[PDB]
Amino acid sequence: LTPNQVNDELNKMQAFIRKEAEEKAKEIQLKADQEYEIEKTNIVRNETNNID
């Protein structure tokens, strides 16, 4: 049935939504790691200059 095929195609479109969600989650994780590393590295340097 084409409407049943339409339902399958709508499910496939929802799959493109799930892939988008996974990509967004991966981007969020990458941003988290990058921000944590940058914050740990840059802030300490000035602090180390003050501490030293």
Binding site: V6, L10, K12, M13, F16
Partner: protein
């Protein structure tokens, strides 16, 4: 005065011509906003317009060529435009190539255009401005000729 009359007449002619919709975008006043470029952007919803023959099956024949990439719903075309197909159908912008292919294969000659709330209000304002400019230019020309 003659230049003003010519500009007003040109505006009136444009307003009269843009309201046909037989092979172009119809008047925004007679058009439907939702799912017709009002919102309906990205993955939220869809918008489509074409003229495949004069039957729903032909519109379904054209819509079958979209490969169901996005907005798999069959296109529905019903209007008085050329006593033939004039549709406000679903074809998501995330499948713009497939949206075009939904009408290109069957030679539907798509006539899609932006019809958002701002666009529809601007079109209505433009038509009213053309009519008012025609009337005001006629009055000004009559006064200028009397003088």
């Amino acid at each position: 005065t003659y230049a003003n009359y010519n500009s007003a007449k040109t505006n009136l002619a444009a307003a009269e011509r843009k309201k046909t919709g037989d092979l172009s975008v119809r008047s925004l006043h007679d058009i439907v906003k939702p799912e017709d470029f009002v919102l309906n952007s990205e993955h939220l919803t869809t918008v489509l317009v074409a003229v495949p023959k004069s039957l729903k099956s032909d519109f379904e024949k054209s819509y079958e060529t979209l490969s169901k990439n996005v907005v798999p719903a069959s296109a529905s075309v019903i209007a008085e435009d050329a006593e033939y197909v004039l549709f406000n159908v679903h074809l998501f912008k995330k499948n713009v190539q497939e949206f075009t292919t939904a009408a290109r294969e069957k030679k539907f000659i798509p006539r899609e255009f932006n019809y958002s709330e701002e666009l529809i209000d601007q079109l209505k304002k433009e038509h009213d401005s053309a009519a008012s400019l025609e009337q005001s230019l006629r009055v000004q020309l009559v006064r200028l000729a009397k003088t």
